[PDB]
Amino acid sequence: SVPSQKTYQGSYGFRLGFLHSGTAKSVTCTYSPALNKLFCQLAKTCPVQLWVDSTPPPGTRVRAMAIYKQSQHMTEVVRRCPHHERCSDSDGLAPPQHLIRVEGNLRAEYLDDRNTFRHSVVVPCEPPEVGSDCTTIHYNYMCYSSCMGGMNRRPILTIITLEDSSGNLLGRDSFEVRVCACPGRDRRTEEENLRKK
Ligand SMILES: CCN(CC)C1CCN(Cc2cc(I)cc(I)c2O)CC1
Ligand SMILES: [Zn+2]
Numbered sequence: 001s002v003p004s005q006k007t008y009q010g011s012y013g014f015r016l017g018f019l020h021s022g023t024a025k026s027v028t029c030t031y032s033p034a035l036n037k038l039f040c041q042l043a044k045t046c047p048v049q050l051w052v053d054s055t056p057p058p059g060t061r062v063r064a065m066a067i068y069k070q071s072q073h074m075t076e077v078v079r080r081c082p083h084h085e086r087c088s089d090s091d092g093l094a095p096p097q098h099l100i101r102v103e104g105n106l107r108a109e110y111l112d113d114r115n116t117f118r119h120s121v122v123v124p125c126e127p128p129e130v131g132s133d134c135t136t137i138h139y140n141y142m143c144y145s146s147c148m149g150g151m152n153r154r155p156i157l158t159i160i161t162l163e164d165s166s167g168n169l170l171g172r173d174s175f176e177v178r179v180c181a182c183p184g185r186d187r188r189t190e191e192e193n194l195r196k197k
Helices: 183-196
Strands: 015-017 029-032 037-040 046-051 061-068 100-102 109-112 119-124 135-141 156-163 169-179
Touching: 015 169, 029 183, 037 183, 061 100, 061 135, 100 119
Parallel strands: 037 169
Antiparallel strands: 015 046, 029 037, 046 135, 061 119, 061 156, 100 135, 109 119, 156 169
């Protein structure tokens, strides 16, 4: 099975937002709107914003899952490589196999799907802090795109779904991810390639 990646705002007008972090060689996480692609360093904080037009019901949750982007790989489960799944860098909550973690949220839950075997991490949907207009979730990606025996240079997408308390679909958005040593340079390069192409 391949989970849908269709953008769907749904009844609550759900969509993601990203900061404008620039492309300096020192930057650790940066988003390209032109590529709809997040570039980040291994295990570093990735702020992702949640925006809605109206308040969803109590019990609404927000799930993140990775899938391979390319058609010939979309069916393979995205997981950490044989090295990283064994490096004992657990935060006490995330299974060591999971590529995507949520940072600093005690209510995060990690799912190994009993049928598809796909991994995901889900948290309660919460209102913005007083004074803010959106809610931010901090994600970590725990392997490099290049990890041998894992992603092995294959591009992935992160799919973010807004769910009701049963896990039914309320909204969906997605973005490509590259986990790399120099996100600033790589974003600049890929945006240049795009502009040329
Ligand atoms: C312009 C948008 N207006 C409506 C007029 C409001 C602003 C206030 N929010 C509250 C709210 C609750 C949850 I739980 C999650 C999120 I993210 C969130 O924004 C709801 C939308
Ligand atoms: Zn790895």
